[PDB]
Nucleic acid binder design. Sequence first.
DNA 1: AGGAGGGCGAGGGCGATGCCACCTACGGCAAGCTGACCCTGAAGTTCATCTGC
Length: 205
Amino acid sequence: RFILEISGDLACFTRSELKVERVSYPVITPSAARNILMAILWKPAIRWKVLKIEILKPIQWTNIRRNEVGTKMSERSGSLYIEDNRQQRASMLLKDVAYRIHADFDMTSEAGESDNYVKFAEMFKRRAKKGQYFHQPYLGCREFPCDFRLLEKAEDGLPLEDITQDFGFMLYDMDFSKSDPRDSNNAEPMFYQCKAVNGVITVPP
DNA sequence: AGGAGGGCGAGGGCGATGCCACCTACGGCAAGCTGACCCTGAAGTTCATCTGC
């Protein structure tokens, strides 16, 4: 288990419902929490698994309308001209977040030869303490960086001390099981937070 | 010639240096306008275009 300690000035774990008008999930999504732990280290042998988020700064919001673009980019049309494809996505962002994601991982079917769980474990451990990553972890949106740390047990004060808000059914981790290589056909599994007692435990599927 | 050229101690004492009121009146402190254009939508289909046949 790794008690990595994602933190950042802003964060947007955009609720699936309020995607066009981004309203962040009140805490780190276990998908966004996990994909962060793939940004620091991943390989198609490691399969990350968030075991317990722990909120470390209170759920505080700042709305940010960004002139986002409306349409994907495409081989077909060789430019956007944003002023033609403009959209103004509001973003109820999570200001001053922090999350100590108690996450571990497993070995996939394609673990390869060097399937050593300890190898990837210490690889990620060195990456996180050193600060290395494949990708500066995205707090839900890459516009938001995860000023992370690989805590050992506990090195920050979690604010939802007494029993606190149950954020309801949050996106857990989009189901890339039916997908071929590179996540084509997925689905969304979702979870009762369970509550936020003081740091939400997640459910392994 | 050799003189002596003041010695003394007073040089204010007393009180008053203001009294009276007034220190503003009047009214106005805004008028008139604008405070935004423009777009950017969901949802769906069409339509032009592409790939494959």
